[PDB]
Amino acid sequence: DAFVGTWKLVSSENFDDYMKEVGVGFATRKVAGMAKPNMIISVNGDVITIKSESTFKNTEISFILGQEFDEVTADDRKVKSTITLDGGVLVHVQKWDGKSTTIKRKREDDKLVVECVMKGVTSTRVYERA
Numbered sequence: 166d167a168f169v170g171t172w173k174l175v176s177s178e179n180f181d182d183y184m185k186e187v188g189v190g191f192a193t194r195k196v197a198g199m200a201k202p203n204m205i206i207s208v209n210g211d212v213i214t215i216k217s218e219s220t221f222k223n224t225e226i227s228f229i230l231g232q233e234f235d236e237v238t239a240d241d242r243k244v245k246s247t248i249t250l251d252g253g254v255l256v257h258v259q260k261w262d263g264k265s266t267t268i269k270r271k272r273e274d275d276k277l278v279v280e281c282v283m284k285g286v287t288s289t290r291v292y293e294r295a
């Protein structure tokens with residue numbers, strides 16, 4: 166389907182502001198800001214796996230749509246995550262400390278477009294097939 170593949174980050178807008186809003190400290194934002202991860206999405210039956218791979222940080226989640234799971238994020242938050250498919254978009258909410266953030270992954274033409282929202286801050290990251 167639309168999401169399976171290896172997707173290399175090619176553009177990012179407002180990610181520093183987004184990380185700051187989430188609570189990431191300056192030193193960590195500095196390393197992240199310049200990073201160009203690959204996002205590797207695969208599916209096996211009911212289980213979707215998403216890996217992010219980069220020089221300074223690798224992460225992986227596996228999940229079933231609509232089933233809450235515990236996630237340790239790249240920035241070491243311990244969150245409760247739920248991912249659903251709504252109108253073709255993978256909508257990922259992370260909840261922690263009465264806070265939330267959403268990560269929406271959408272397929273647009275040749276691109277994987279990822280919108281991250283924390284309060285009034287929105288970051289848009291575009292990835293293209295490796």
Ligand SMILES: CCCCC[C@H]1CCc2nc(C3(COC)CCCC3)c(-c3nnn[nH]3)c(-c3ccccc3)c2C1
Binds near residue numbers: 201
């Ligand atoms: C180098 C350590 C940096 C730690 C700071 C953290 C800050 C939060 C954060 N959030 C995300 C997303 C948002 O999730 C809330 C962005 C859209 C997908 C998930 C990503 C990411 N994953 N895949 N693509 N972008 C990364 C990240 C991971 C590896 C390299 C660069 C950035 C980081 C790094």
